[PDB]
Amino acid sequence: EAKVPAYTLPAVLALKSGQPVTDAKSWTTKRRPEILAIYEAEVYGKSPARPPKLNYEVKSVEKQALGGKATRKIVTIFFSDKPDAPKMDLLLYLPAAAAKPAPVILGLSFGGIHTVANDPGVPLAEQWTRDNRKQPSAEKSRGGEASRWQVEKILAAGYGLATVYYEQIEPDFAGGMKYGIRPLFFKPGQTEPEPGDWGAVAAWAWGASRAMDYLEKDKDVDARRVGLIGHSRLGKAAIWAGAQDARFTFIISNESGEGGAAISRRDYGERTTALNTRFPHWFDGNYKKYNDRENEMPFDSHMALALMAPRGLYVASAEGDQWSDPKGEFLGAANASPVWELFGKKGIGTMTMPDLHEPVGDSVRYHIRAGKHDVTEYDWEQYLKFAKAQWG
């Protein structure tokens, strides 16, 4: 950490011109649109507009699911009317006893909807494998991601869990674009994304907002109390989804790294390069000019995160976060927090990184936990306290 470079962050509360942002009105009307546009063009890419009509079908509604704890729904959301188009299966669990429409936490899932809980009545999903092949999952994989979703805790807290498998939006390997939604929006004869067009992180975020499109039509769901959670690369998606979509009352970005919550200036552009090399589909084409600081970024993570203000933001890390940079994720959150004060909200409340298992902050929160890159019970215990603070 004595070997981390020094840097001066671009100022989140100054306009590009240099003029200061003096109040919430000026953020809303001037600076936030400026920051959103920067990220749209230089990082995530421009996405299509919200579809006027959502084409979807409620395939399945089962009460008493999960040993009676939950009403389960499975909702198919079509990204095109054409058959064998890309489509999305949304898994919803609502508390069996729900007396009114329930708050819902929406998540992007690394696995199929059968991995989210131990639920025999959920069809085995097709998944994309280590070899970039798509094939039906084995039954042994049911519930493999359950510890990452803690559905029983969520329902116990009085909330619902909605999940989508991200690779139905776009499969996560270089070349999987043809199998996803991005091609559906090309222009007459276009065959490749323009350099400022969305990449995969943005497509995943875009699909989360179509999930939100359904949840607002569901009459068992409190459309005014939905949040969004993403782990790792899907925490990047969740940051941009929340930026794009004011219906998410909060987002949770679990260990989201570079192009997510982590300050990029804590190295010399080598992470940016490794991401753009290994995962050329994640960000847009313009983003590759920031490789190894060939160009200086007129932005850094605190600005992307401030796109949530005044809504809730939870950033979290793990001691061994992979090679990810927990301090850089804390600093992203901490440097975003002043925007919340413009709105009369409290942010992180400190500029010093807390100790393990010591969460900080109010409308912007942070914790770091011991363990490896994952989502654990401990994370969820805090997320649900956060959700209550946001929702009461």
Question: Which tokens sit at 73?
Answer: 């729904």
The verdict on whether 373 is a catalytic residue reads yes
Is 189 within 8 Å of 277 (Cβ atoms)?
no
State the catalytic residue, choosing from 209, 232, 253, 264.
232
Q: CA 28 to CA 25: how far, in whole Å? A: 5
Q: Residue count of the chain, please give it.
A: 392
Cβ burial, residue 200 (10 Å; 0-12/13-18/19+): buried
Question: Which tokens sit at 20?
Answer: 């200061």
Name the residue with tokens 């890419």. Answer: 45
Is 339 within 8 Å of 363 (Cβ atoms)?
no
Resolution (angstroms) equals 2.0
Nearest Cα residue to 173 out of 125, 130, 206, 115: 130
* Residue-number span of the structural domain to which 171 is assigned: 1-392
Q: What is the 3-state secondary structure (H, E, C) of the chain?
A: CCCCCCCCCCCCCECCCCCECCCHHHHHHHHHHHHHHHHHHHHHCECCCCCCCCCEEEEEEEEEECCCCEEEEEEEEECCCCCCCCEEEEEEEEECCCCCCEEEEEEEECCCHHHCCCCCCCCCCEEECCCCCEEECCHHHCCCCHHHCCHHHHHHCCCEEEEEEHHHCCCCCCCHHHHCCHHHHCCCCCCCCCCCECCHHHHHHHHHHHHHHHHCCCCCEEEEEEEEEEECHHHHHHHHHHHHCCCEEEEEEECCCCCCCCCHHHCCCHHHHHHHHHCCCCCCCHHHHHHHHCCCCCCCHHHHHHHHCCCEEEEEEECCCCCCCHHHHHHHHHHHCHHHHHCCCCCCCCCCCCCCCCCEECCEEEEEECCCCCCCHHHHHHHHHHHHHHHC
Number of folded domains that form the chain: 1
Question: Which tokens sit at 62?
Answer: 């089962």
Q: CA 207 to CA 316: how far, in whole Å? A: 23
Cβ burial, residue 84 (10 Å; 0-12/13-18/19+): exposed
The verdict on whether 253 is a catalytic residue reads no
